[PDB]
Amino acid sequence: SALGKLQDVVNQNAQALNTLVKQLSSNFGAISSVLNDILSRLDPPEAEV
Amino acid sequence: DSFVIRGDEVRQIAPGQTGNIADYNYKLPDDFTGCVIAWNSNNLDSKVG
Amino acid sequence: ASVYAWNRKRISNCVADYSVLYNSASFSTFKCYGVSPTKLNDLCFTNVYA
Numbered sequence: 001s002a003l004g005k006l007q008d009v010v011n012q013n014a015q016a017l018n019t020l021v022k023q024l025s026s027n028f029g030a031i032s033s034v035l036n037d038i039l040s041r042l043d044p045p046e047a048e049v
Numbered sequence: 050d051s052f053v054i055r056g057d058e059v060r061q062i063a064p065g066q067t068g069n070i071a072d073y074n075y076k077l078p079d080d081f082t083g084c085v086i087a088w089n090s091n092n093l094d095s096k097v098g
Numbered sequence: 099a100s101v102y103a104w105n106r107k108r109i110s111n112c113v114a115d116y117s118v119l120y121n122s123a124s125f126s127t128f129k130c131y132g133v134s135p136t137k138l139n140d141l142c143f144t145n146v147y148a
Binding site for chain 3: 031040043
């Protein structure tokens with residue numbers, strides 16, 4: 001644990017990137033989190049929503 | 050734009066509708082602005098034969 | 099069947115042409131909720147129930 005200050009910065013940046021990548025898996029109230037599924041399932045008036 | 054259709058087909062003169070005269074007779078855009086006007090014309094556009 | 103004893107039929111292992119359902123004018127109401135009616139020929143399904 002001598003080099004914890006640099007490893008803390010590396011872990012924080014990697015965890016922020018992992019969280020940002022993980023946030024694509026959330027649908028945020030939509031029917032799906034995949035854009036291609038919405039564009040292939042729905043008409044543009046509701047796919048727009 | 051004036052035409053004569055059935056009584057159940059007046060819901061298809063609208064943005065974002067699926068239907069028959071919407072696809073092959075008269076299509077409205079999704080960003081349509083204006084007013085659709087409909088009134089019964091059984092006394093004028095109908096014959097007993 | 100009646101609505102209290104509604105009949106459930108499984109649909110599986112078939113290729114389905116929904117364009118004869120869209121182009122028929124015999125249905126007074128043809129309203130889809132989780133899917134567009136015109137995209138039904140482009141997708142694959144399981145657990146189809148009537």
